[PDB]
């Protein structure tokens, strides 16, 4: 229509569970690329010992992943919290 | 210098309350006159001692001959402006139909000198009024982050912001055709542009694969005119500056009566009270319902029926507001002893109720609308430099 | 004398019309001054005509100092009371800011004489008015049968039906207690009464597993009465005749706010109603309902808040209204040599139209309200599907 | 005079074909400069006999030294204008490159004369072009009647309608801003208006879940847009257009330069900046490759060479129907039997010429004119009367 | 030199993005003059140079008379030639139409000259020009591969791949008809062969033929225009015995209003039609989502196509992957006052801040044939031999 845009940012999953400190999440196939360039560098985290972050409107929370399995077939991902900024 | 509850509260606590106020499901704002300072705009004392000055011979006879000004707060500039435009307006409608010329000769003079004042404050950029592109500038940067935060704390299926103003100037229209947003207004057309209440009813979508907010004016705007007896016309500042914005300030005694439609002059009229009447309908029916918050700034509280209005809204338990007043110490230090305006005491009681329903702001430099659009809640440009390549690429 | 799209239409199709229109979702009628007169009420004119014969000496003060109403339409009976109340009004308001004492004296009655021949004309039976059982005589059947026939042409699943009206008289309640029929009008209580916005969303219901309408007074009544400023109260005929009408008749006093009417032509400048703006939001949250129709009678059509409801609810493919306006023919000829009022242009732009969602009917006493509630049908309980009855009525004229 | 698929049928047939193609999905109707005839307009032979006797001294210089235009078909108004201002252009672009300089201010006043005699034609009123309330007057009756019928014989779930036009003048603007109907054009903003090829997809909506609307598509521009340096189309009001830019062409008698966006040439392809040009006939093509689909013209010559091949290439999709509206039928079968004629006379026989029953034809004169096509056109019915079983109420009425 | 938009890539880092870049729903490839080489073409420059020094005397009023050439750029070897064609055309129709005569000849004198000398390069073969099968030859190698990987890289359900095209030779025609595959073009019929435009929109279908589209913006060979206003289709064998023999061994003999190459006459209404019809598809296949554009043999002296594909790329889902070979000679020349638009826009393009703009640059392995290899990868003769003897 006219001008005015408002999304940006580009993702891997969407949280799905919470099960006393441990944290599910289900992975997508809808970004074919999961490259997502932006003002510096790219990223893409596929792999245990790694960080990820999640946006609450007013802070970021911050976790590291510790597995990963699978159940297209599907996939999923384990995850602790370690603080926010 | 931020009580809720009658007790203190810190910065980081109500940088979070905001956050979730600013969640449910209406959300308003309403502004004032202070809000227009940082852009080329003047306050409503300014606006008379500029007037006591330039004239001096006019201010006895609306004190001794035809007591419409009271010496006590002419002397200490606590005049109200629209009331007193608003009587010398009938004063002269009765001369005329009675044929009394000597006095009809006498208020023209009068509100051919007090247009003058109200309407050159409003211009906010003097002879660049009548061009383009006057939202690019860097006096309007404070007006649009305000509506681009307003709109993406919304989520999807949720209703629309709304925005309740007591001045009568573009500040507000000139910031949004930048962005790219829609706003409604009452008015449709182009050739011949009219009000129809019923437009503040609908919206837009899309059929194969956007962005709108709704503005109210309660006493005006420098575009609106009549020309028929039943019938309320709108236009573009361009075509205003020629028809009747420039003989206002280049000419001495040019008045035309029941023609202009601010500050709420011709009230007596059929026609122009009913544009009033529904703006006033339409904001005492959004601040009652569930679920509703409301933020204010720049108003000073001299209007008896807001007050009672937004009083009787807080016996629901789902309506929620936010205030901003930065002379407060001063106002609690002279209602202590007995003293203050009916300004004053109206905050002075609502800070010391004994609600969680309501907030204060006063800080002095604090509690401006500078800080008041930084206090909102933001999550945590490379695509320019094309337009101007291409705009290089001449030849 | 029935236009339908511009063009014309004909009896027996109009008969045909109303008898769909009357089995759709929503239904509606809006009445004023003129469905009253068949029972004892007035009109502005002979309101007009009252005061200029009994006060002949402001009439004279009014034409030849303050210059508020000409000698050709005194002598031919065209004033308008109602933009005049606002002028007298406006006077007043500057006399009293500058301290005269004789201007603010000598309009107080020229306001107070015409608040009180506005009255006068509501009563309908004089001073039987607070008496009982007065939906029992004769001037009062068409009223039931209107009420009858709005109510007894709706079936399960759907609504209610809605009345609005303008005039202050009493003359539907004291028609609906005659049959046993509840009337919510937003009071609650006996011994003291009060208005609450939210006694228009209720309805009735059986306990083990029922007739009720709805009635929004516009312009205000004769038994409402205002004392503080968030509380409206109601009371009854035979109460209030004794309190504060019978002192406003037979006695001549100054007049203040004993009962709130808005008479006026500016019903905005009054800013602490809050009651007049209850009925224009449900008024025009009815008329954007889907399936949808209105009819009126009575109304002259100078009221400017209503015309632009009525013309701007014309975007909708699924409203109907049906409008009676007897001196139409006095009208078009007016129009057609460029001259006319407000009011004639107004049914005249209705008129001259291209949408089939709009139609009028003029001709005199044929348009009056006698006649209205005649061509509304009554119901068929159980229909015949007629075959056997039809064909047979096909062998009349088939056989020879 | 109707032809169908090449055979004849009459006026009582040709009316229920009308029925049931207005009954589709999509509809539209294309119109050109006859069309606003009885509103005030002209055409090109009338711009050709309006610029002979107003500057014969250039007319002669055209057939004498350069060798434009035969002397013969200048007599008797058989020119064209669009090959015209294209050869000129042509003449304008090689002095230029030669550096000559007496041929450049020759050729000025040529192609200035010449695009001043367009605009008086197009703006209808005169001097009155810049005032208000313009389509209360009777000549645009039968502009309203026309979008009138276009939306109400709609229904739910079906999309809105379509307008195509190539005029210049607001005879379609100045008509629904009376009714109160908006019509989506591309453009946004009241003080600062711009052209954003994406909000042809708006559409309204409610809020408690106007309601007509519809489209506009002008393909060769109008008197009211205006390309600035900034490279932006812009959109202003027609009294700030004739202060503005519209009164020194008309008066001022000055040199031509881009100021409003018309191209009446023939191949305007020349024009590359023209992205406002490209959009319409995208649009147009993509509508006539829908299913279930209907067009009606009237007001076209069938000059133009891009439209004609849309046409045709059209006609091989089987759920796509025409109906166009030629009053010079006769006469131009009779010229091509000669294997003479024009080359627009060969495009209307060919078409009148097929064996598909798609295609629909009508002369006659006085009888193919705008008023009549808007009378051909039907006002719904809303309460079908479903009459299996009330169709024996027509044998009711005489067989006695 | 992998310049990959502000930083630098390997071979594999780019045959993978090459793989990536496959996978999406809408493929689309551009080629110039330059991919034509391999086969047997001429680029801008030596048909210029041919020009001067075979026709030297005629080059004068082209900068004294008529000032349609500049000397500067004359001598530098750097000058457009099919605007001067369209221009000339243009000085000849106002010459026709005004009745003179000597500026009538001397540029019927010219327009030969400039078409035999622009045909002759395009013709691909010499005399073999009217002869069956030229796609069985050596030289039309690479092109056969293209097609079929091209087209073996797409999934079921999915779009057709899209080529666009500057030049106006039959190579790719003659290739796709030795495979066996049919390209649409907007043309239909054998007998009387026309335009029709919205034949872009068909494909094939079985019951119980794959194919693709070609996109050519400047014309061809075999397309022409006669007495009357239709533009006509033929082929080769035809065309030759028609009017090229002619062209190419004759002085002096000219045709006006006949041919359409290369955007000669495009101040007809009839012909710019058919050169619109394209670039304006062009405009609706780059604004689509998820595609990807691959460019080689394109000098971006071009005012249009520069600015299209400049505004194309707003929206992200569009990619484009350039070949140019002389990068440095011209990075190191922007430094200095020096240059044109041409390497202006190519290191504004590779100074960009984003993963889109892909410029590539080895001398010599950037080029058609590397440009083929990068891609991925999805009897006859002894038989029909020995059928054919027995
Ligand atoms: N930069 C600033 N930012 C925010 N607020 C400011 C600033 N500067 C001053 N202020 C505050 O702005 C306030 C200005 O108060 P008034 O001029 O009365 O504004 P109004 O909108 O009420 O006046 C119109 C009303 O008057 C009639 O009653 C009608 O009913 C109208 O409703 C001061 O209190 C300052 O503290
Ligand atoms: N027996 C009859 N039956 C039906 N209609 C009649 C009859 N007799 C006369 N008429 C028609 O009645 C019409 C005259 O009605 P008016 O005097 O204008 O009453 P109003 O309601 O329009 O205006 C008064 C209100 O307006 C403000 O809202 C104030 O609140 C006032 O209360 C004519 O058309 C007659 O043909
Ligand atoms: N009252 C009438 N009602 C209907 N049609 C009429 C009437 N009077 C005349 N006509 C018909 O109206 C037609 C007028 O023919 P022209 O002036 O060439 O139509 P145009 O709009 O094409 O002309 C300009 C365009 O032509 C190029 O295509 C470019 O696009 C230009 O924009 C005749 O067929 C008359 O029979
Ligand atoms: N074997 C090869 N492989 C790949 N590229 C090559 C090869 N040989 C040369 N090149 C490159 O091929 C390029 C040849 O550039 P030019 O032929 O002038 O450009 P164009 O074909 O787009 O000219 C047509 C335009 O001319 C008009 O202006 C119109 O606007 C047309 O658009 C060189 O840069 C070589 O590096």
Known sequence: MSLFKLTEISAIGYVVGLEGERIRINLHEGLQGRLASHRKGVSSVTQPGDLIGFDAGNILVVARVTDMAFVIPLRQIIAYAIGFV | ?395
Request: hydrophobic share 35%.
């Open chain 2, 1 to 395: 210098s931020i009580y809720q509850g009658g007790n203190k509260l810190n910065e980081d606590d109500f940088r979070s309350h905001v956050y979730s106020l600013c969640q449910l499901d209406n959300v308003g704002v309403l502004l004032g006159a202070g809000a227009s300072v940082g852009c080329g705009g003047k306050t409503m004392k300014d606006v008379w001692k500029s007037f006591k000055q330039n004239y001096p011979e006019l201010l006895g006879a609306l004190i001794d001959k035809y007591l419409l000004v009271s010496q006590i707060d002419s002397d200490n500039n606590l005049v109200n402006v629209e009331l007193l435009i608003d009587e010398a307006t009938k004063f002269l409608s009765v001369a005329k139909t009675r044929r009394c010329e000597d006095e009809e000769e006498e208020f023209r003079k009068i509100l051919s000198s007090l247009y003058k004042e109200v309407t050159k404050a409003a211009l906010l950029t003097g002879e660049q009024f009548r061009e383009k592109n006057q939202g690019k500038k860097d006096a309007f940067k404070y007006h649009k982050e305000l509506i681009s935060k307003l709109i993406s704390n919304r989520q999807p299926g949720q209703s629309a912001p709304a925005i309740f103003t007591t001045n009568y100037d573009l500040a507000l229209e000139w910031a949004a055709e930048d962005l790219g947003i829609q706003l409604f207004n009452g008015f449709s057309g182009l050739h011949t542009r009219q009000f129809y209440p019923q437009n503040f009813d609908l919206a837009f979508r899309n059929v194969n694969a956007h962005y709108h907010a709704y503005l109210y004016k309660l006493h005006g705007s420098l575009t609106w005119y009549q020309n028929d007896s039943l019938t309320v016309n709108e236009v573009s500042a361009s075509q205003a500056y020629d028809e009747y914005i420039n003989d206002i300030i280049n000419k001495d005694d040019f008045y035309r009566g029941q023609h202009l439609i601010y500050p709420g002059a011709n009230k007596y009229s059929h026609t122009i009270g009913f544009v009033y009447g529904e703006m006033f309908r339409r904001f005492g029916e959004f601040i009652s319902k569930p679920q509703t918050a409301l933020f204010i700034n720049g108003f000073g509280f001299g209007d008896y029926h807001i007050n009672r209005i937004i009083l009787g809204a807080l016996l629901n338990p789902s309506f929620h507001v936010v205030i901003y007043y930065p002379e407060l110490k001063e106002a609690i230090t002279k209602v202590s002893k007995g003293g203050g305006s009916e300004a004053e005491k109206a905050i002075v009681t609502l800070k010391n109720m004994a609600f969680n329903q309501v907030t204060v702001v006063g800080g002095g430099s604090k509690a401006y609308f500078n800080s008041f659009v930084e206090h909102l809640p933001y999550p945590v440009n490379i695509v320019d430099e094309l337009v101007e390549a291409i705009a290089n690429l001449s030849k």
